[PDB]
Design a protein around this ligand. Structure first.
Ligand code: HEM
Ligand code: HEM
Lengths: 787, 781
């Protein structure tokens, strides 16, 4: 038969199944398909050829095509996935037909492997999903200029599916508005133009409103240089204009640099304004976490809404935030979603970087633009550094009182003018170790490492006196007042210190101000007791209840007495004995040093006079003016008044200075001490001064004595070099005819040392502890010459 | 057999042709296809079925297949347009197979009604056509994140294509720079996002080019809601990032709110970066007419120049300025040019709006501000002070600015000010005028002090200004202005003029404005170099001054003073060139040389007359430094035959116990070597006296300042008496310098000064004739 060779040598797999669905034939094309050999399946049910997972459903097809023939249909051709003997489920073209071989109900199947063309179709699928995700809408036309094929982009842009857009004139599909009439003519011209061209038209949507499109026709020829295809493409000009203006406006608002959440708010406002029927909410990255940053007030739920993602990223690296927008389907094309998303995302990156930059700028702004004092950030840094150093500072909060009333009356033009000299006065009395800051408004924070109560009271008093002179503006007095809250405790944090200071400040201010106060006692009792001491001391000086002690000093080699040096002393009926080392600083603090000096010199004169009444007794008497902080305003009158009201021959009494008060500074005490010298008072010192100028000054008004200090004498045994220093000092003494005194001598050993070093007088316990004022006439004649 | 119905009754169109191309079989499906009858087609030429327009060549194709073999291809399949008997033409798929009967050559053609094939071929066309028409790269990724799709846009913009890129991960396919901003991780995860996402990358072409791209990935799920593919679009954001950089940077500028002109210049520079080899001009509407705002520093001629212009308008649409660009033809695309133009337009409009919208202390570092500087200079002018003004501009800041923005340009300036403060002297008024410019006002005017200050300030910034491990090297331009009687504004203007000159010339340097003193400093540097050469060729000398006891008139010792003579400059005294030595940094060498020569001449004098008692070198007047005492005394004494105990040295108390004190132990070891000392003041109280008597000084040198005026000032007469007495009390020798007259000599012999020196006995004598004087007139009793 002619059919035998044609059927045998064929490239399409042919199979036949009987009415019972059993196979009886195979060909090399079928063997290339599936993989089974002919003999493996000849005369067997089709089931094994059927896919293993499809066999359960195949009997349904068998019944449908055998009991009713699928409503009397012989067969058909379509695509099907074939499982090759290797197990691969390849795609192929199958065909079925009904055949009456042997007069029975047989079925003939044809198969052709279609893997390559299936792959081509898959490539089509990928590119079409891309075309859907292909920003600007595009459509294709045959030379007859009828839309043959389109995309999801054009479908979104003009509400026309491919089923609606197949094979018709582009305008007929896109019913254009009649006004103006030239729209149709121009679009037909561009439609049948064979060269690439672009123009502007005024199309009308499926659903309504006019739009102005920028239509673009372009050609594509073939190998034979004939029109093969055309592309008509466009996306927009109207919403593109909208978004260009949107970006302009959002840039303008962002340039206005509004706060972080307000920036989010403006972004939301504009994004809603354009893509209405949508919700917007941005997340900022803080501590690496997504925090709700902004959200539009239009949070009403909208049916059929799709979320759309975007990542706000800074100049480099990980995300800085998450942008996401939910939009109602059909509001605008997916391409326009992508477009607005890009602009919003990058604009948000700019906004967040702006926020971070302003954060850093504010952090680095730790100073003041008006006064110039370091500001609260610097103060916190400084206190934290002090705590780390483990040094306990004392924080003073100084608050101005009258400045608010000044603002209320005359205004800031006077308030700031007052604060200028307020801070100037602060800085004038500032000290090298101190640290000043301006936390806020009319409040200041002063910091010092001094922890003594006696020093704290002094610093507070200086600060309080800063306003001792009322502020003068245009000859108008302004008596401002200061409320001072101090705090100092061990182990507390800067936060506690500041809070406590502020509370103390408010308490004292509301109490009346013009004053200072410690933390709540705490040590306010330690201050009350010291105030008690001060009041008692003032009363004591007024009543003249003090005691003056006396201390002989004797020549080292003769044993004869050279003189006596006096020392102030105070015995209290209540508190008992209190030393100068404590009540002289207290005298300075309570402003009684002038008085104590007066009294000590007076009593010295009393004793000298009464003793001369008896006999020559005292050759010379010494009183330590330096140890009593004797100021410039005291010397001439305070000495001469007594020296003359009673009878003292000048050379009888002597005074002592520490050479620091002697350096010129601004007192020029030189003249006062010269007057004392003229009266005949001996001059005693402890050092020679800065250099040649110092020595020349010392010799110019020739001083009489030079007093080696106990600090040197006691450590003489420790250090031989100090012995050399003393040798030099005594040698200079002999050179200039200066009497060299030594203080704090204690034992026979130091006495022998000074003997060999030619000290020429000794004062200290080793010969007599300072004996009370009345034993002197007995001790002198009963112990001298203490040879 | 079933072989017959399998074809005869088959609904699949199949035809057979023999060696003569005669149709031997024609199925009813073939009848349905063509329109012929089986009895009419059987035994006839295949051409009858072949389309008439194609029939003539069909026999030729059959003959070629029969004769040439064509590699014995078994079969093939493709589509073609069929022509029916009635004349109607239709499109049909088909396939050919080679069959043989009776040992001859036969051909079998099978036909399919191409409906899905036709539609899908039409589509494939339309789709490739559409994508190609558009010029946006796009690719597709399988679930394994492997590219399985490309387009002409992707291949042209990336070089790669499916032929090479098929089935390979995007990161590997996409070369990237060496972690410039750690974008490797960005690419890696973006290629792993499980939802539609988008960011930006830098990728390098096959040639390698840092081009910027906007990756937007979008997932597409199958019908059953499973991730099927990931379609990604690379938008060419080279231009778009130009837009970005433009805004971002100028927005940052706007936030920093610089001067109007500075904003304009920022715009100029970055727009120029955007448009290569272009020119930019900016005008603004002032007083109702366009007046210059700014312009690009570039002003050279442009070949094939193209001019574009735009009117900057406010929100209301009214004009606000005129921007213009000149670009070289072919350098930039028109689309790019227009985009940069309009973005610049609107952004700069916002900048102008910010300008329209827009206290005696710097709120950032802590220096005064221009108002305070003006007040300070005014308060100096009213007192008639002629302040020397150093206007310091910190150059290379632009790298800091572009790297970390104005917020950190502030940090850089903070570091600059912090480094400057540590050296700022008292009586020096440092303020910050604006941005990157500081004003240091000083009172001292002597040119030597001015130059020293300038050098110190330039040096203190020697070390890089490190910020967050990014040591930006910043440089200093120091304009100097100074002129008697000139006001604050002129001083500032001229200082800025000199600063502008040195900045444009390169910076990292300092410059006077006034040319007279500008050449004066040049001559001063000439003198410095001359002395530098002179010391190196060691042409110097040392004049001596014998000094004698006041009792026997016998020689006590000889001083050694430096000297330098040049044929060009003539005599240049030490009093003048020693500070020049300080400036040039050769004081150490001068000290070395004076020491060496004193020792050598001592040895030479030993070789004939060893009687030379002692030699004294005035280190205090020579500005000796801390670390040179021990070495360059010991070296000289050992090298020469001098005994060390023969020469002494002189040092003042300030240098004795200030500027640290390791100098103290160095003088300890010097005394250990045994060199006698000679002190000036032994000041600073009892501690000073302790040092004095602990390090045997062996002599005290009363200077001319005191020796003179002795007959007049009673206070200094008393000082002299006291100090002579102190020396006599110790075992110290007292020296009186600069005695000039017989009455002064008589007074000094009264106060018992031991050794006298000065012109009253001997003007200094050169290296020779010292022996003549010493041997002729020694006992000048
Ligand atoms: C890889 C092997 C096979 C697969 C994947 C497969 C799959 C299918 C499926 C899913 C259907 C339902 C309708 C359609 O998709 O066309 C069908 C229909 C059918 N199948 Fe199969 N089948 C295979 C093998 C066969 C063979 C070789 C025959 C031989 C007769 C057969 C007999 C039938 C019949 C008679 C129908 C009725 C279809 C109609 O009348 O339109 N099956 N097949
Ligand atoms: C509408 C009907 C047909 C058309 C338009 C057509 C067209 C062509 C053309 C143009 C070629 C040249 C090779 C090529 O273009 O790839 C060709 C090849 C060939 N055709 Fe056809 N043909 C038709 C029907 C048939 C039929 C029914 C047969 C029966 C055997 C046949 C046998 C052949 C053979 C043997 C070749 C040689 C292939 C080769 O050498 O590569 N043609 N055909």
């Amino acid at each position: 038969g002619i059919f035998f060779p044609a059927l045998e040598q064929n490239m399409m797999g042919a199979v036949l199944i009987n009415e019972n669905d059993e196979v009886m034939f195979f060909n090399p094309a079928a063997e290339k398909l599936w993989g089974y050999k002919r003999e493996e399946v000849i005369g067997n049910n089709i089931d094994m050829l059927i896919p293993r997972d499809l066999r359960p459903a195949h009997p349904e097809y068998i019944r449908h095509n055998r009991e009713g023939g699928k409503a009397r249909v012989e067969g058909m051709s379509r695509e099907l996935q074939l499982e090759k003997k290797d197990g691969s489920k390849i795609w192929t073209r199958f065909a079925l037909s009904k055949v009456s071989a042997e007069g029975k109900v047989y079925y003939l199947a044809l198969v052709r492997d279609a893997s390559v063309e299936m792959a081509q179709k898959e490539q089509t699928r990928q590119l079409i999903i891309a075309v859907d995700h292909l920003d600007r809408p595009v459509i294709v036309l045959d030379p007859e200029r009828h839309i043959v094929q389109c995309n999801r982009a054009f479908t979104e842009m003009f509400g026309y599916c491919i089923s609606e857009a197949s094979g018709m004139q582009p305008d007929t599909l896109l019913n254009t508005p009649e006004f103006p009439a030239d729209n149709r003519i121009r679009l037909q011209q561009l439609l049948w133009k064979t060269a690439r061209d672009q123009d502007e038209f005024l199309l009308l949507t499926r659903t309504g409103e006019k739009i102005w499109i920028k239509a673009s026709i372009s050609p594509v020829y073939d190998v034979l240089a004939h029109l093969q295809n055309l592309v008509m493409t466009f996306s927009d000009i109207t919403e593109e204009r909208q978004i260009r203006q949107l970006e302009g406006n959002i840039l303008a608002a962002m340039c206005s640099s509004p706060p972080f959440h307000e920036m989010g708010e403006i972004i939301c406002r504009n994004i809603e304004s354009v893509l209405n029927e949508s919700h917007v909410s941005l997340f900022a990255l803080r501590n690496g976490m997504p925090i709700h940053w902004a959200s539009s007030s239009h949070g009403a739920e909208i049916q059929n809404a799709q979320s759309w993602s975007a990542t706000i990223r800074q100049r480099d690296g990980a995300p800085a935030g998450i942008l996401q927008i939910k939009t109602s389907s059909g509001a605008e094309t997916s391409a326009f979603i992508e477009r607005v998303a890009d602009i919003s995302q990058h604009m948000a990156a700019l906004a967040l970087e702006q926020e971070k930059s302003r954060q850093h700028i504010e952090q680095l702004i730790q100073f003041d633009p008006m006064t110039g004092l370091p500001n609260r950030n610097n103060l916190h840094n400084y206190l934290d550094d002090l705590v780390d150093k483990a040094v306990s500072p004392v924080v003073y909060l100084i608050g101005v009182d009258h400045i608010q009333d000044v603002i209320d009356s005359l205004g800031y033009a006077w308030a700031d003018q007052a604060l200028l000299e307020v801070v100037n006065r602060f800085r004038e009395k500032l000290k090298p170790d101190q640290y000043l800051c301006r936390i806020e408004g009319t409040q200041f924070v002063l910091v010092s490492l001094e922890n003594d109560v006696s020093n704290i009271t002094q610093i507070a008093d200086e600060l309080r006196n800063v306003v001792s002179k009322p502020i003068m503006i245009d000859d108008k007095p302004f008596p401002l007042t200061l409320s001072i809250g101090i705090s100092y405790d061990l182990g507390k944090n800067r936060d506690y210190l500041l809070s406590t200071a502020h509370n103390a400040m408010d308490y004292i201010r509301k109490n009346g101000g013009n004053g200072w106060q410690f933390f709540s006692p705490a040590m306010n009792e330690m201050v009350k007791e010291r105030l008690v001491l001060g009041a008692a001391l003032k009363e004591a000086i007024s009543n003249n209840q003090l005691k003056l002690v006396y201390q002989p000093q004797i020549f080292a080699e003769t044993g004869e007495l050279y003189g006596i040096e006096a020392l102030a002393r105070w015995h209290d009926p209540l508190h008992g004995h209190v030393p100068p080392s404590r009540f002289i600083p207290l005298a300075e603090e309570i402003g009684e040093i002038e008085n104590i000096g007066r009294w000590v010199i007076a009593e010295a004169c009393r004793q000298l006079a009464e003793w001369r009444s008896q006999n020559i007794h005292i050759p010379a008497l010494s009183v330590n003016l330096s140890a009593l902080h004797f100021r410039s305003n005291q010397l001439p009158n305070q000495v001469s008044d007594a020296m003359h009201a009673w009878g003292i021959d000048g050379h009888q009494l002597t005074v002592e200075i520490t050479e620091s008060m002697m350096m010129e500074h601004d007192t020029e005490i030189f003249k006062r001490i010269q007057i004392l010298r003229d009266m005949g008072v001996g001059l005693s010192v402890d050092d020679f001064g800065t250099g040649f100028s110092g020595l020349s000054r010392l010799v110019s008004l020739p001083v009489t004595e030079i007093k080696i200090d106990k600090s040197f004498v006691d450590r003489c045994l420790t250090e031989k070099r100090i012995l050399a220093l003393l040798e030099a000092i005594t040698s200079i003494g002999q050179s200039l005819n200066l009497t060299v005194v030594a203080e704090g001598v204690e034992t026979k050993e130091q006495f022998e040392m000074l003997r060999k070093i030619h000290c020429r007088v000794i004062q200290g316990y080793f010969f007599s502890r300072p004996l009370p004022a009345e034993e002197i006439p007995g001790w002198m004649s009963s112990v001298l010459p203490l040879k």
